[PDB]
Amino acid sequence: ARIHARKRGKSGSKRPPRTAPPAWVEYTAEEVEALVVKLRKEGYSTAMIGTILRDQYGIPSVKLITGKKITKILEENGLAPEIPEDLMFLIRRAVNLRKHLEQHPKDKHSRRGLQLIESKIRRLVKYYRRTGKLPAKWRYDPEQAKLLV
Amino acid sequence: MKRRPRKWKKKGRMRWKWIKKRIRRLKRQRRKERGL
Amino acid sequence: GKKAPYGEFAGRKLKLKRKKFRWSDIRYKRRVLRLKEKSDPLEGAPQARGIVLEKIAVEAKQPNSAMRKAVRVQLIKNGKVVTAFTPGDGAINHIDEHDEVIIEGIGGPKGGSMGDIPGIRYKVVKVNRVSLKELVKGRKEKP
Amino acid sequence: PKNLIPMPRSRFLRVKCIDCGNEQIVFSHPATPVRCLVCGATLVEPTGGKGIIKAKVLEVE
Amino acid sequence: TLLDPLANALSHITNSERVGKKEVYIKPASKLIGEVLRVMLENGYIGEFELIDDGRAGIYRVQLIGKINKAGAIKPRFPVKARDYEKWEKRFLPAFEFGILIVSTSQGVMTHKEALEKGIGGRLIAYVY
RNA sequence: CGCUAUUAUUGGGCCUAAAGCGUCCGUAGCCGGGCCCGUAAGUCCCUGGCGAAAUCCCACGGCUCAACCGUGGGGCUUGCUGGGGAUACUGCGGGCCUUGGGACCGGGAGAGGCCGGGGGUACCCCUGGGGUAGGGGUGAAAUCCUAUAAUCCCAGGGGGACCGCCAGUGGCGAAGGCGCCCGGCUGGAACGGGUCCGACGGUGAGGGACGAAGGCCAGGGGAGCGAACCGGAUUAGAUACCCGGGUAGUCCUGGCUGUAAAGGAUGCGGGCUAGGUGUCGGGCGAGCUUCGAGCUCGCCCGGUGCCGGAGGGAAGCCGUUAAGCCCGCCGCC
RNA sequence: GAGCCUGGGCUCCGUGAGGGGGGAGAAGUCGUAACAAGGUAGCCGUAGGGGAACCUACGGCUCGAUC
Ligand SMILES: [Zn+2]
DSSP, X not given: OOSSSOOOOOOOOOOOOOSSOOTTOOXXXXXXXXXXHHHHHTTOOHHHHHHHHHHHSOOOOHXXXXXXXXXXXXXXXXXXXXXXXXXXXXXXXXXXXXXXXHHOTTOOSHHHHHHHHHHHHHHHHHHHHHHTSSOTTOOOOHHHXXXXX | OOXXXXXXXXXXXXXXXXXXXXXXXXXXXXXXXXXX | OOOSOOSTTOHHHHHHHHHHHHTTSHHHHHHHHTSHHHHOTTTTXXXXXXXXXXXXXXXXXXXXXXXXXXXEEEETTTOOEEEEEOOSSSGGGGOOTTOEEEEEEOOOTTSSOOTTOOSOOEEEEEEXXXXXXXXXXXXXXXX | OOSOSOOOSOOXXXXXXXXXXXXXXXXXXXXXXXXXXXXXXXXXXXXXXXXXXXXXXXXXX | OOOOHHHHHHHHXXXXXXXXXXXXXXXXXXXXXXXXXXXXXXXTSSEEEEEEOOXXXXXXXXXXXXXXXOEEEOSSOOEEOTTOXXXXXXXXXXXXXXXXXXXXXXXXXXXXXXXXXXXXXXXEEEEEO
């Protein structure tokens, strides 16, 4: 996490260089997609869908087994989010923190956290505008985020 | 004030902090003699 | 860190950087603002004509001990008054008052003062259209 | 030669649930609780790092 | 952040030369790095480089033979005409035919000698001596 | 003009010599990971039309040679424009990738911040009881308190500030700075991770946010300490240092000021160039076990210290937590 | 549309009772603040005080010595 604090942590994943899927996998592509859809309807996020598929069903790399991604599957169907998940998570955090600071005016160390969150939001907004997943004039407004969430 | 850390070496010199106090006095007198 | 800016398309900022920091050299600043032309009583000339007002003597700086002979001069260009040195042994005996005199630079660091003489910037060359060197030797006669 | 191509220290495991007798492939470093798809019992409990297996390990892939 | 991998490759080679290594590993690979190494091998400055496939972007394993004094990237990549190679030779190299300027041309990557033979110019990207 | 690498593109410097904004967020601009397809704006080659003469270089010829003049060949005019071709690099456009970055989950660490409740000694005053001649302070004294009973001991009541030992070469935080216990609200980081997105990145002029002590405005409060001031001694003199008192202030609520040796006197990101020995957090592997959220050894990641070979430096010294070699951006001399 | 008159706006220049600082100068006086633990360790920031170098308070640095 280097964006603001400038600490050089390294705690990620080690994916092996695979060209093809393994044989010990019990499921097929159609069953995998059906599982994705069921776990979406239970109200899970993409990242948790994948974590559950890896921990409880033995599926590594939905994209290995199928040839698609989880969000592509959900868009092939009608279950994709209107705005992206990462942005939504950040907006929810900001809304909660703002209601906290309305009751705690002199905290003064969590307000900088709010500012950092909103700078992140703006970075992502600028990216998604260019790429087309948001309109070219979308703006972050807290008063309307209150309803977005 | 712009300050120069060289001035704080008290060789060939009186102490900088007291030079500063003097400067400020002369400034105020010049002001309340210019009219303000 | 690495010197900046170094990029292929950063020439505007390079030029601006150099223009900015070039004002920190006194030579460029004086040349471009014409400060010597503004404080110089000779008005940028190599020589000047003047009339003698008073003969005087100046004390040499320590650890030397001597009285350097000199003369006050009013400039016919602008009326300003300066002090000039009379070189030689006895040169001051050949200069009277109300005489006209030619003034040049004495020759020193940054076009200024020289040696143990304090605050004298100029030197006498001619008296009533005759050379001090020849007067001091004894060839010619003052008119 | 050295740590050139990073390779995973986690593994997948084929385990057996005693009561129901079901066979199941599961992950060694889980982040959710792992259950049997028949009983509903817990087979792996999540910790930091490696999970605590509460069943039988038949095979390691 | 990471801005230029060729510069890093060549600085790594220089430092490992200075302290006497035999094999060196270059983690983000590129086709420019491949072509520069090809030129260096043809001119005898290295030995037996190979490419390795990680899933990300390959690695290059290079063997050294104690022939490089200095190697470096040329930034910015100056454009140069066929009649203006000597200025840059004098600026980057110690003697008149000693080392190689590596030039990128529309016909490919080569040395300035080959480029002069063909009568073409291009862009400067590296020097080796 | 050169000397002057004392203006530095070629080609300089910023721990201690002049010089890193007090710290952070981010606008323009500058710099930007890997593969495939296209384009041909930058870039390169070839050819047509222009860039007056004089002035510059070379040879030959005419003045006794020469300077000069003439005949030819090149160059100069910092470049402009009509066409033909190439496609490595840069740019534009369209698809892919996961290593950089962001998101999410899990068991943990920590004086990070705010709110509320409950406490601990110590100090000052007051009221009762006892007892009676001094206490205090200094280098030595004196002011001062005291026979209207002090100093000292005991029982009580009320007050305001502060959180000892454990406590560290420790930890968290952007910095400033943060230590009694319990509960609630909240910010960030590390580790583990065949989880998600798929270059979303770096720096950052202008601009904004925070920012020790002290000082100002308004409202409260005031035990101890204590600028100013008032006394006593020392002293040649004492507008000081020592002693005895004491106003603002130091605390709370809400605002202003925007400063420090705000110092690692060392701007931020990335890659490479021997390590040894300690310590904090997480993980894994081995042994012990009083079976303990326990003890010991080793390894991986990330923080924080000491020493040190090559190397660097004017030297002091630095040395994988560079003051070394490379790729960038800002500020200053 | 000259030129004259009038009210305007910048700039440079020349003088002023009296006041204010700075720089040089064989050599006038008062003290001795700084360099040694310089005889009360020195220095930064803020505020108050004093013939003058200076003193005190709050917070900070070591560019500070001895056990
Ligand atoms: Zn079961």
